[PDB]
Amino acid sequence: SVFVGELTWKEYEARVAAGDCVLMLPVGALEQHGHHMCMNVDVLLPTAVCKRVAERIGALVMPGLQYGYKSQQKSGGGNHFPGTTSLDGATLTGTVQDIIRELARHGARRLVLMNGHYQNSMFIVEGIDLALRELRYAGIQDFKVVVLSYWDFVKDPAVIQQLYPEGFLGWDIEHGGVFETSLMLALYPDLVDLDRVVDHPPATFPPYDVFPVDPARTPAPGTLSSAKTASREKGELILEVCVQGIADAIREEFPP
Amino acid sequence: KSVFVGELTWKEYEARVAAGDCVLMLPVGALEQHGHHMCMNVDVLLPTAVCKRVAERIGALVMPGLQYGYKSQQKSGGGNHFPGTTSLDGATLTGTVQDIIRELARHGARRLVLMNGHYQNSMFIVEGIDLALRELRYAGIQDFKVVVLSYWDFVKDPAVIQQLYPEGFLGWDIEHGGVFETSLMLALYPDLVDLDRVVDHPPATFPPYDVFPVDPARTPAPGTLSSAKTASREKGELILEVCVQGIADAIREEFPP
Amino acid sequence: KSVFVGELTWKEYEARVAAGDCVLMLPVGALEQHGHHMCMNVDVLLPTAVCKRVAERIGALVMPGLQYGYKSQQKSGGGNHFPGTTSLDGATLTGTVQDIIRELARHGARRLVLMNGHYQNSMFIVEGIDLALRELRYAGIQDFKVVVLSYWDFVKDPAVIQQLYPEGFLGWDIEHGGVFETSLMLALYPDLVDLDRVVDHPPATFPPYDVFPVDPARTPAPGTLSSAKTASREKGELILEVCVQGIADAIREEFPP
Amino acid sequence: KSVFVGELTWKEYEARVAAGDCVLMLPVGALEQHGHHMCMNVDVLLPTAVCKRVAERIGALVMPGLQYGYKSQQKSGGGNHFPGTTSLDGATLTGTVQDIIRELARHGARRLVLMNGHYQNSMFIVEGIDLALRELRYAGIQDFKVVVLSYWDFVKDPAVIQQLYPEGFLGWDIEHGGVFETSLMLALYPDLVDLDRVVDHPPATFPPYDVFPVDPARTPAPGTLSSAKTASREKGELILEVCVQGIADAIREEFPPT
Amino acid sequence: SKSVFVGELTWKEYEARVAAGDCVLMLPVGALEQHGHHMCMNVDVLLPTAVCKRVAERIGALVMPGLQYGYKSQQKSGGGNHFPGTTSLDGATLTGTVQDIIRELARHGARRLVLMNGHYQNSMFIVEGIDLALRELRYAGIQDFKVVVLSYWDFVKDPAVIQQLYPEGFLGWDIEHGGVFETSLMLALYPDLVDLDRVVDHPPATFPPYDVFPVDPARTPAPGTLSSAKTASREKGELILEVCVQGIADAIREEFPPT
Amino acid sequence: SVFVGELTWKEYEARVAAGDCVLMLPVGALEQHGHHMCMNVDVLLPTAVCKRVAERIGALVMPGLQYGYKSQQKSGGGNHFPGTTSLDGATLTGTVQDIIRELARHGARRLVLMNGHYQNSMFIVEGIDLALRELRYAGIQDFKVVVLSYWDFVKDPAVIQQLYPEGFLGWDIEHGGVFETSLMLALYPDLVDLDRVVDHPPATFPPYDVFPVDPARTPAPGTLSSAKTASREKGELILEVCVQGIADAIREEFPPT
Ligand SMILES: [Cl-]
Ligand SMILES: [Cl-]
Ligand SMILES: [Cl-]
Ligand SMILES: [Cl-]
Ligand SMILES: [Cl-]
Ligand SMILES: [Cl-]
Ligand SMILES: [Mn+2]
Ligand SMILES: [Mn+2]
Ligand SMILES: [Mn+2]
Ligand SMILES: [Mn+2]
Ligand SMILES: [Mn+2]
Ligand SMILES: [Mn+2]
Ligand SMILES: [Zn+2]
Ligand SMILES: [Zn+2]
Ligand SMILES: [Zn+2]
Ligand SMILES: [Zn+2]
Ligand SMILES: [Zn+2]
Ligand SMILES: [Zn+2]
């Protein structure tokens, strides 16, 4: 198995003892994803990508974080929705920090954090920084971390056109949209019900945020753009593009 | 469709809670060494498995489990010096339980059952519960009720303890990665258990105190505290039904319709 | 008749807030390197200047700004390895924003506009707001409204973008110490600028991921991410009026009497 | 070009630290009520002004000041019940001081002077310094030196006290918004002072203890603890030279050039 | 020169003992908690301190000022934190206290600490304080600081002694709050703070295999005790005291041998 | 007994039940006090005064805080002396806050915090503020706290004249001096060995603080003044003044009803 959770400590110890062990940590969230998808999408997707990348480069995947930072309106609908279960920033940062500290104790020195929830970013970054600060106090400076969001690897203009033949608008309105739905169709068809999609126009917000969040500024279904044009085929395209891009990036950052 | 909150859309979840009788379950585990014969997510798999079967019988829902738990103690987990074991600081675990309870309250939920499969998590789960309730109280909510239990506590009946432990019983004290857990795994996840690797050693014994930093020489090299050589899928099935039934009834009594 | 709270008497401030409908504005910047050609308090100066002008037009008051912001990230500020750059830990920035909101609420204020001038601050400002609003609810206050915004998010009109970037626009991705900020500075604080020191280097290109510890070699030696050789006072005047008007109308719509 | 780090480019700042004996100064103030006659940023303006002058005179640099400080105490600042006064929790002020020292240490700086302008700040500035120095030790750094001082502690000359308080000096325990601060403000920021609005009331008196919640009746209505009627620009310039001079020498003593 | 209590020593006396190189320090960790109608509320501080004092005299150790406030009371372990008098700290507060103290003893040059807990619920937070402190010490280059944490009652294991304490059969520390065990030790150590006449004789408390929150006052005896101390005696107390003192004294010699 | 720890919860409940019960809490420290005194002086003195004041006005005394904030050179010698065991500020604040929260839960509403360690003050104050903030969130606003350092009641020139016949240099250098040593001779003479006093010249400091602490600026013995002229008689004088003033103040702030 490529999952650390499915290994005995002896199998894990042996892999780390090899000296060139690369670990991957998916970081997601429990969040509403419209009427058509389940709420663990942000955990499922990064974990899936990690698995496939891990199989191709010989890496191991740590148990993913199921709860992430609070959902923001302009990018995820808003934390006012039912089901969405968010952690405070300090809690997420502390979790990332504790994990990096423990991996360092194991002898691991190469970590890839794969974010599946846009809003986690800064808290993952702070957690990495606080952990490296600590490792430095303990005499460790060779621990390296690569943090990335798999969607950032779908930049090829060609690829974007096959995914958005009617023109692209940006990652800003993608919550529960074509991109994530297509991936879910390919990896978890049982958890996607395209027939429930609400084909509302893309969501537009002014250049600023309001708190407490105003429900009426987010489309009723919770999506920021219609996933009507999503397909298992598009999902397969995105997946391979992400897996190959991420696998090559890892080889480049963590060379033997 | 599913009993798992993560496998539902927010609308389905919303509907289940709006019914006003919704009971939610949260498994709290750990990524910890379990000897040479079992994978390291045992403490997550078991409570989650027990939650699913209880949820199916009483109509409850199961929240995504907490994969990381408190540090492993030598006298009940072998120690935190083992590789693979990835523990959280107490504050981090406490804060996670606290944030989740707060969010569930925001959804309108008021009935929560925390089920941990990692002995050392207990006190931090309790503090997180206490801190969340205090906070809910400041918010004007005093009807949020929480039940916290470790599934193995429901295996009390002597008749069941003879079946599992013929040659005698040395309490849950020494039991990490032993008969009990290994049996359940054999029944629930036979592919994640290789009993052929079990290192059969005599029951670990410690003095009536703890030492820090942990001295590696005071815990069997395998990481186990007792041999799981007599574990069996049959013992597993027994343990499983006993727990599912007991916990299911306990919940019905604490959260009557 | 200043718009700055710090320049007022507590009785003058009190009358303003007790008058009702009082809008407070808090600039949130940072002490960060901005190349060879600009001073390091740019992120405090710019948003403060915008606040002053907006407050003068709509009748709002401006709180003293937060001088220190969150750590600088390579893909938008060059990195926190540069000298001079003095960054706070996330929890520190978040707690500062939280404390201030709590106090304004005690004053009786209920309308706050947070104007960010440092890209990396956003999420910590957001958490501060959320933690504060949560707290106000415990106190029985649910009518406190906050609007957070970065003054640059108001420069989107194609026509305006055309005049600022004739030879093309590569986004705000690498707009640190570039044409945008440098232009604004030339128009508001020309003495703290010196285009002759600008290093006319090509745009910065980074892979679709981040690496820690930060690799100093992946950031232009000067600290800038894009050349500001084409900055000017004229462009500064354009951006300024655009932002002031856009933000002023925005505030009127979010905070009507 | 300036003594304010905020007004320098990172290159110039780096060149100054490279010298090896650069001194940095950090003003720590507060946004707090100061009666009917003065603005509320007095505690930032004054220590900032003194830092500027001291820094220019001795060749040091001034960091951006902390605009928000610890909660106002009744017996020393009227109380945190007044509107306008915007205070931070102790942990927040402490953490801010701690983070700054950590960063300055990263630049290579090793000499810092913290000039407090708000009486109640001190202990939290101290914990911040302690926690920072503890971290530096873990990181292998033990040559970072910090001097913390409240500028008013340099006005102790009996002859100076006389010129400032003919009728007598009843201590700094009721000098909130009184003759001392108002005088300095008249010498530095006269536009932010209006003696016409001063409420000439007798010196507030307090028992040897504090009560919480703070009882509004135990503090003069206007917010001041003593009258600033006798304040003057001359006294202010007197205080200014005494402080700048005194602090300037203490710094040269504690941070001798190399 | 003066006593086994660090608080009664001058810093020079303390310094002289630590300079020895193998000085053992003991820290009592108790609580201010209700103990039924028959005993005072500082029992959890008194008992461990009393055990520490005696152990210190026999092995040559010093005793630090005890922590008076401990972690919140649990219904199934101490009646519950809803009774008046009981004054508990949050987990983070007790952990931080233990952490700060260890950090300081290390600065003194001490390297051997025994934490004697007298309140069942303190255990895990003491443990986290130890772990966090040892982590800090490590960043500071210190890896030779050793900590032994124990609850004195765990040294009362011999079946023989157990029969003499419970001639009618044991019941486990699951309901030994204010029961026979603590009351006997008090009758032997502080008779003036105990009055058996007020002891409410009721059947042992029993609880399901789980806890509920908010706590339900009804699931715990009214007096606060989980079992009766009616059969408590100054004699049983003298027996328990000696067993613990000797057991712990020998355990400490084992863990901290003289250099 | 006036000690809460020596009461039964029933007896304590009965006292708070009166509705006007005043609780007193000593806050001290474990700190070096020269060659002539033990290190728990800062706990013994305020606890002793508390005891007397409580017996006199009918109040109860809570267990004292044995550990306090870090010793400062200019008022405690420095935190570099062995024996001195100090808490971080956050830990002391949190301890005060938790106790006040618990007392509020008991129904109690009157608390006097008696400090006996100079450095604790502001952290005791933050703890009080934070706890009252919480009580407010919980709908409780009738909880009143009086905080004081017992030595602040010894102001009368006549009384000082008698204690320092040959002049007085303020509390600025009283650590382990005449004042505390005199009280100890009158209250705990067995804990004082006046024969060990190191009669050195008073300590002098500039108008500022230096960090890290330089041991060279503190008399080797750890005292800031010589206690050679301390006496049981002066101890009884000081004790009279304190108990008197404090008792009167509390009856003033917490009148019976
Ligand atoms: Cl998303
Ligand atoms: Cl286990
Ligand atoms: Cl920027
Ligand atoms: Cl002041
Ligand atoms: Cl107990
Ligand atoms: Cl003192
Ligand atoms: Mn998301
Ligand atoms: Mn476990
Ligand atoms: Mn910036
Ligand atoms: Mn002030
Ligand atoms: Mn107890
Ligand atoms: Mn002291
Ligand atoms: Zn998503
Ligand atoms: Zn397990
Ligand atoms: Zn900038
Ligand atoms: Zn002032
Ligand atoms: Zn007890
Ligand atoms: Zn003292």
Curated annotation (Swiss-Prot), chains B, C:
Signal peptide: none annotated. Retains 75% of the activity after incubation at 75 degrees Celsius for 30 minutes. Changing W172F: 2-fold decrease in catalytic efficiency. Optimum pH is 7-9 for the forward and reverse reactions. Gene3D superfamilies: Creatininase (3.40.50.10310). Changing E181Q: Loss of activity. Zn(2+) 1 binds at E32, D43, H118. It catalyses: creatinine + H2O = creatine. Is markedly inactivated in vitro by heavy metal ions, N-bromosuccinimide, ethoxyformic anhydride, and dye-sensitized photooxidation. The record marks Q120 as: Coordinates a catalytic water molecule. It is an enzyme of class 3 (hydrolase). Zn(2+) 2 binds at H34, D43, E181. The keyword Manganese applies. It comes from the Bacteria. Keywords: Hydrolase, Manganese, Metal-binding, Zinc. Pathway: Amine and polyamine degradation; creatinine degradation. One of its GO terms (molecular function) is manganese ion binding. Its cofactor is Zn(2+); Mn(2+). InterPro entries: Creatininase (IPR031034), Creatininase-like_sf (IPR024087), Creatininase/forma_Hydrolase (IPR003785). Binds 2 Zn(2+) ions or 1 Zn(2+) and 1 Mn(2+) per subunit. The Zn(2+) in the metal 1 binding site can be replaced with Mn(2+); however, the second zinc in metal binding site 2 is much more tightly bound and cannot be replaced. The enzyme with one zinc and one manganese ion is more active than that with two zinc ions. GO terms for biological process: creatine biosynthetic process; creatinine catabolic process; riboflavin biosynthetic process. Mn(2+) binds at E32, D43, H118. Belongs to the creatininase superfamily. Cyclic amidohydrolase that catalyzes the reversible conversion of creatinine to creatine. Is also active toward glycocyamidine, though the reaction rate is very low, but it is completely inert toward hydantoin and its derivatives. The proposed catalytic mechanism involves two water molecules. The first molecule is a hydroxide ion that is bound as a bridge between the two metal ions and attacks the carbonyl carbon of the substrate. This is Creatinine amidohydrolase. The gene is crnA.
